[PDB]
Design a protein around this nucleic acid. Sequence first.
RNA 1: AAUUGAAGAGUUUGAUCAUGGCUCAGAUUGAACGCUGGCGGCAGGCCUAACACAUGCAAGUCGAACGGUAACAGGAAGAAG
Length: 154
Amino acid sequence: LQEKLIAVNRVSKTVKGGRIFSFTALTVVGDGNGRVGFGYGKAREVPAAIQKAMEKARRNMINVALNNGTLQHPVKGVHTGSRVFMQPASEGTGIIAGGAMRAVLEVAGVHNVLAKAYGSTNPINVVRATIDGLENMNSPEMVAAKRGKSVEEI
RNA sequence: AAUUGAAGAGUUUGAUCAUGGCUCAGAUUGAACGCUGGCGGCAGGCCUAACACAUGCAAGUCGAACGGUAACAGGAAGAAG
Ligand SMILES: [K+]
Ligand SMILES: [Mg+2]
Ligand SMILES: [Mg+2]
Ligand SMILES: [Mg+2]
């Protein structure tokens, strides 16, 4: 599995004494072949937070039906305030996406894609929107299956 | 063969998500200014005062329309070193 650290953030809660700082780590993991998951870890230290995130990511992986390291069709993904658009691209396009979407698409095994993040670009929600977009993407076979047709008829 | 094409980031908070403005990375120019400055090719060069303008030049040509002959170049006559 390829692993990527998207974001580390210092968060704080107040107590009687003062402030207690801690760290959050957002990570994605993927096999580079249409399997991808994200993880979010919290700890008092940065490396502990990353380790927790990576462990979470490995167990929460979903399957994406790719085509030649690009998408099957244009997809929209939404989570919270994040709305993402992703489109299939030709070979040699590369990942034309912002960093959070790029990390997801790279480990998933999407080599060629045109993307755009609308609304909030908060990494935590962009990653959820992106994976939401990918996981509800249909291949021609499942479309043919559900409609009760052959793939050439589709 | 001839529309293969779309990236985000910083900043409100003790921290958060959202909302929302401000700001930045790009491309561009009849540019200007600062520092610096070797050569070439190709292009470009009053965006303001349609303000005022010295001087030179930017519209002539035809004798195969015409009377002519001021030039000067021949030609013919008539005479002087
Ligand atoms: K903003
Ligand atoms: Mg959770
Ligand atoms: Mg916004
Ligand atoms: Mg502060």
